Design a binder for this molecule. Sequence first.
Ligand SMILES: CC(=O)N[C@H]1[C@H]([C@H](O)[C@H](O)CO)O[C@@](O[C@H]2[C@@H](O)[C@@H](CO)O[C@@H](O[C@H]3[C@H](O)[C@@H](O)[C@@H](O)O[C@@H]3CO)[C@@H]2O)(C(=O)O)C[C@@H]1O
Length: 278
Amino acid sequence: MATETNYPVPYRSKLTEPFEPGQTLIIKGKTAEDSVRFTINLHNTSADFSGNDVPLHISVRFDEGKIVFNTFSKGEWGKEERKSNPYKKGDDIDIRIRAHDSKFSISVDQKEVKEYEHRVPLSSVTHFSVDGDILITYIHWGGKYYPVPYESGLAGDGLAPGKSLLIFATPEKKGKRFHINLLKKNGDIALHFNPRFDEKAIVRNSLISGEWGNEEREGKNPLEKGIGCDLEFRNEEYAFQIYVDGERFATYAHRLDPHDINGLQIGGDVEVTGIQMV
Ligand SMILES: CC(=O)N[C@H]1[C@H]([C@H](O)[C@H](O)CO)O[C@@](O[C@H]2[C@@H](O)[C@@H](CO)O[C@@H](O[C@H]3[C@H](O)[C@@H](O)[C@@H](O)O[C@@H]3CO)[C@@H]2O)(C(=O)O)C[C@@H]1O
């Protein structure tokens, strides 16, 4: 209701392909002190008809103080399922919906709060809409089931200054530690990002010619077992700017010339749900 900008509401988007197991839909926005409610719908339709079926309807109610889930099909609504609404009028919201074969897992502020079993085909979801008292500031749909240990190459130029590698993951509930390596062609690790819960610290280092370097820790681990996190590795001219959940966690001065960072590896006790180059 403030600055239209991107994603103005009523917002609607036709998916390029049907929503599939794995795959997450992320919605972030701002609310006003007078916001009453907003909705997020996964639905069916041709491309302008609208309605039809709504496999998953999410209603965030500030008046009722609840988040409500339901399904509409064959012209009828089923029985609503509710959870408490942790948000107060005003303040930002972060809701994420990941599809699985037997249900949708919905997280609020990166915390799992609802498991909604499919009532109608997940495949009938061809669009998603957002409407109501919310100023959308971020939307993204994609990802998949990333096996871990994970391993792959990066684009053509890969990670170069001016670019950033965005990773969505959730440290495992009973995990001790995990790591992410940004590698160069010859196999050297430009950056080793290694959160260690058993040591309450995130270790950063580089692997050059089979040798581990100095090693930088300290900064207070901002991650939490079982809680989702948004990791951003901003490659800059003099260093990597490491962002955790929107806040700069650390800076890591380059030990290997940046440029040509074309490899990625992820291992340890962690679940990866999204990887993207921005
Ligand atoms: C007293 C001592 O020698 N400490 C050495 C430690 C310990 O052997 C280690 O912490 C025991 O778990 O190892 C040191 O080098 C480690 C460090 O580079 C970390 C950084 O993540 O990597 C360790 O190897 C990891 C590997 O990277 C993972 O992929 C996986 O294989 O786990 C192994 C460890 O089992 C290095 O051993 C260290 O500083 O911690 C060197 C210390 O001298």
